[PDB]
């Protein structure tokens, strides 16, 4: 395709399925001469990561630390440059054009999450700040310095536009509600929280992974993590719930494995297909049994979960 | 024990003859190893043992193009910082032809045997950078008929007079160590204000590969230097000669010095006390190359016209870590 680069960078950072079934890929060059990034669209997920078989592709100024779909054509990127950037898929869906590139963070933007309405987004950074964006106005609505160390993860609630979670190296898990004068609420200190995921049906339930490879289930109202499991031998990088009525939970780690857990956090599936850090997992909206993972080993693996 | 800096590799890469001599040696070896009828079917496995930032890798490739022969290259390097340069060059320029290996040649488990092992592990006194020990741990992955470039090297010694250098060594006294340790260690120095008192004589020789049942890198040499002048002995200048392949050689001996070659300066083995030498007297020096599993060192003593103390016993002042 035109404007698309001939080569894809080795370090695959993100993989996101669209409702129709198209695959969004985020990649960075974390070594060699150039430290840039790239965004890719694959209408055929089996073709990934082959550049000559993509629907669309574009080069970003810097690496892609994180990304998210903004509807069906929008792509919101957390950049190494300190910019939050919105990219838009064109009418024919063969080009990826930049809508905005706003440099509001003073260090790497590590995490981005679109709020329930789809009109606003939350970004977290190594600069310790959390910002709330208005996507149409292309501006920052609010800037929050609640944490005392780098923001590791920001996760917008599935159904409440004013509610989100954040975790940081300051060992805090914050529950946010922007309708309060003091918007954050801290929900004994232990291992650092590294990943967050809201339960898709239980509006007050969420899961968190830690640097020690443990996954824990929390109820915001009760404020107690009575359910936990030692899933990984290393840092829990990501947590992704399946699209099922009774969802399964995918947990990805720096130990290079993927694990699929049930409601009681018991293991149903374990995959060691990756030979480097597993960076993202996306469940297929077309086939709910299919789970796609990306890694720093440039592998796009398609898993059949029983 | 230490890793070389980027700028150290940079200056030595500017040597006007070292690399063209290495290229010429590899070129001659390829023609002698594979005939014209086999030029498109026989792929020679070349291993650059201590590749640095890659100049011997380029010399090997240029030699294979010159010989019109096929080669498969391995670039082994223990310095991980130099490995960064090697892996960036392999991705951008060399490709699949060159396999970069980040390892010590003594610990690397090679996936196949080599036809040719190319290395430049030589010191000013030939074996003082532990080329014998490194190549001994690497010869197991060399074919039974395999060639080592260099094939042999010989160190040379010459007695010298220099009151200037004697004073420079004397000024090297440091706190928190033996007050005479500075006289019991060699120095790399571009000798300038001195008097060579007798023609250099060969000291120690090593050959590669070493197919002897009992390999022993320890050495003991007695040298007798005729002196036809009244003078004062202050130390010994050390030089070397190496046979890269057949007639392709390198030398830092003043009489046979390779032109423009600055990659090695001479070595100086001092003596604690200056020794008076009269016309017609003979300077007798004894040198020992010693070792254990952890280190290598030299011991030396003057036995004529007068005895000196044994210098550096047990490597108390100077050792080269293995």
């Amino acid at each position: 395709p035109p404007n698309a680069p001939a080569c894809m960078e080795r370090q695959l950072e993100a993989a996101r399925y669209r409702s129709d079934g198209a695959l969004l890929l985020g990649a960075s060059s974390l070594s060699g001469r150039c430290w840039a990034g790239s965004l890719w669209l694959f209408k055929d997920p089996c073709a990934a990561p082959n550049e000559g078989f993509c629907s669309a592709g574009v080069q970003t100024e810097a690496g892609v630390a994180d990304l998210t779909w903004v509807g069906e054509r929008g792509i919101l990127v957390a950049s190494d440059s300190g910019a939050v950037e919105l990219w838009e898929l064109d009418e024919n869906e063969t080009l990826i054009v930049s809508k905005f590139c706003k440099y509001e963070h003073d260090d790497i933007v590590s995490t981005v999450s679109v709020l329930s309405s789809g009109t606003q987004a939350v970004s977290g950074s190594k600069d310790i700040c959390i910002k709330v964006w208005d996507l149409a106005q292309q501006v920052v609505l609010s800037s929050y310095r609640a944490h005392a160390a780098q923001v590791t993860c920001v996760a917008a609630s599935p159904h409440k536009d004013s509610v989100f979670l954040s975790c940081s190296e300051d060992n805090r898990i914050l529950l946010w509600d922007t309708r309060c004068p003091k918007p954050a609420s801290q929900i004994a200190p232990g291992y650092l929280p590294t990943s967050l995921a809201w339960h898709p049906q239980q509006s007050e339930v969420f899961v968190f992974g830690d640097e020690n490879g443990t996954v824990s289930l929390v109820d915001t109202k009760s404020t107690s993590c009575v359910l936990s499991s030692a899933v990984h031998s290393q840092c829990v990088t990501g947590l992704v719930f399946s699209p099922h009525s009774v969802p399964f939970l995918a947990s990805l780690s720096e130990d290079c494995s993927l694990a699929v857990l049930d409601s009681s956090l018991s293991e149903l599936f374990r995959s060691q297909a990756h030979r480097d850090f597993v960076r993202d997992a996306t469940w297929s909206p077309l086939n709910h049994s299919l789970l796609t993972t990306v890694g720093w080993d440039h592998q796009v693996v398609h898993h059949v979960v029983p | 024990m230490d890793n070389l800096e980027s700028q150290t590799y940079e200056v030595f890469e500017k040597d006007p003859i070292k690399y063209s001599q290495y290229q010429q040696a590899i070129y001659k070896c390829l023609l002698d190893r594979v005939p014209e009828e086999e030029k498109d079917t026989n792929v020679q496995v070349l291993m650059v043992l201590g590749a640095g930032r890659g100049p011997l890798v380029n010399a090997s490739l240029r030699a294979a193009k010159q010989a019109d022969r096929r080669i498969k290259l391995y670039a082994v390097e223990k310095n991980p910082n130099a490995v960064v340069t090697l892996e960036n060059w392999q991705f951008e320029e060399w490709g699949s032809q060159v396999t970069v290996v980040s390892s010590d040649m003594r610990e690397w488990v090679a996936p196949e045997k080599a036809d040719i092992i190319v290395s430049e592990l030589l010191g000013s006194f030939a074996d003082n950078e532990l080329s014998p020990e490194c190549l001994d741990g690497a010869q197991h992955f060399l074919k039974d008929d395999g060639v080592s470039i260099p094939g042999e090297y010989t160190s040379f010694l010459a007695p010298i007079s220099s009151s200037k250098l004697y004073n420079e060594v004397r000024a090297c006294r440091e706190k928190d160590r033996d007050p005479e340790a500075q006289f019991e260690m060699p120095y790399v120095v571009r000798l300038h204000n001195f008097h060579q008192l007798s023609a250099p004589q060969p000291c120690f020789t090593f050959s590669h590969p070493n197919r002897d049942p009992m390999i022993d890198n320890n050495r003991y040499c007695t040298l007798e230097f005729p002196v036809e002048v009244n003078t004062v002995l202050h130390g010994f200048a050390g030089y070397f000669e190496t046979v890269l392949y057949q007639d392709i050689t390198l030398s830092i001996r003043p009489e046979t010095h390779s032109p423009g070659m600055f990659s090695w300066f001479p070595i100086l083995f001092p003596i604690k006390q200056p020794i008076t030498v009269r016309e017609g007297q003979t300077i007798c020096v004894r040198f020992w190359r010693c070792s254990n599993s952890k280190k290598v060192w030299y011991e030396w003593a003057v036995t004529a016209p007068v005895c000196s103390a044994i210098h550096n016993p047990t490597g108390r002042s100077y050792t080269i870590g293995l």
């Binding site: 370090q11 070594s31 160390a149 650092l192 030979r275 | 800096e5």
Partner: protein, 302 residues
């Protein structure tokens, strides 16, 4: 004014250096390995990640590495982590980055003091200082006020302390003092003092008096805006700049442009404006110049 630019994003090293030099900066503080490129040293398969591990030394001349580049330790390196596996990988990675900086001949290398316990970080740095032959400076990035003490009062169930804590407010000086005590006053370890939007009380500032401050870190976010839209500093910030200018510190500008209508070199132009408008040297200072903290043995008068 000897000034530097701090950057945590460097897509192309030659383009970036050229861009910062054009802005008027004398040096660039940058990562030597990609800041997000976490590396495994012990467990397979991530340990066997194919190289290169970073970009080549060939991208810049020897002169450029020796004079224009200040290295930065990667943010994921945590030698004092509560997790054993993180402590071990971080020690191996810290030694790797420090030795790569020594390999390039960098004039200085930035390491952070961002928490109270830096014992294992001090131990690894001390081990590096006593290994091999190199003479690079270590700049410990330490803030006047700890991020935990300057956080917005927006956590409903965790309010910020409103009562004064005299010794508690000088806690970052103790982080520095403990680290340099463990490292046994190495002449190679200095301070890179990070200034914030709200200056602490005078006693907190005065704790830094007599300390080896080599650099002062000025985030773009601490600069106020004037009627013309140019970045400026409050009277209290200017007072601290004049104090640091007497110590001949190198000023480092960190963060993105917060005055987007104006060019980036405007933050630097304000610093040189302050430097040009400082009090001129008096008759005593004209002769005493160059003798600052230089020890002289008293003469034997008789």
């Amino acid at each position: 004014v000897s000034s530097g630019r701090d950057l945590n994003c460097v897509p192309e090293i030659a383009d970036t250096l050229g861009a910062v030099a054009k802005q008027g900066f004398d040096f660039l503080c940058m990562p030597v390995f990609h800041p997000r490129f976490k590396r495994e040293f012990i467990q397979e398969p991530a340990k066997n990640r194919p190289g290169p591990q970073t970009r080549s030394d060939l991208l810049l001349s020897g002169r450029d590495w020796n004079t224009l580049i200040v290295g930065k330790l990667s943010p994921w390196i945590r030698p004092d982590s509560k997790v054993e596996k993180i402590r071990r990988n971080s020690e191996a990675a810290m030694l790797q980055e420090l030795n790569f900086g020594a390999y390039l001949g960098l004039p200085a290398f930035l390491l952070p003091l961002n928490q109270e316990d830096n014992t294992n970080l001090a131990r690894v740095l001390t081990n590096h200082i006593h290994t091999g032959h190199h003479s690079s400076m270590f700049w410990m990035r330490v803030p006047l006020v700890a991020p935990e003490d300057l956080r917005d009062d927006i956590i409903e169930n965790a309010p910020t302390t409103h009562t004064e804590e005299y010794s508690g407010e000088e806690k970052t000086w103790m982080w520095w003092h403990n680290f340099r005590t463990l490292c046994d006053y190495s002449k190679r370890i200095a301070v890179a003092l990070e200034i914030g939007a709200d200056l602490p009380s005078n006693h907190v500032i005065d704790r830094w008096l007599g300390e080896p401050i080599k650099a002062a870190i000025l985030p773009t976010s601490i600069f106020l805006t004037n009627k013309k839209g140019f970045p400026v500093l409050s009277k209290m910030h200017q007072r601290l700049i004049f104090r640091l200018l007497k110590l001949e510190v190198q000023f480092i500008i960190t963060g993105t442009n917060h005055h987007s209508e104006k060019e980036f070199c405007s933050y630097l132009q304000y610093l040189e404006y302050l430097s040009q408008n400082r009090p001129p040297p008096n008759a005593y200072e004209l002769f005493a110049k160059g003798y600052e903290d230089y020890l002289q043995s008293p003469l034997q008068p008789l």
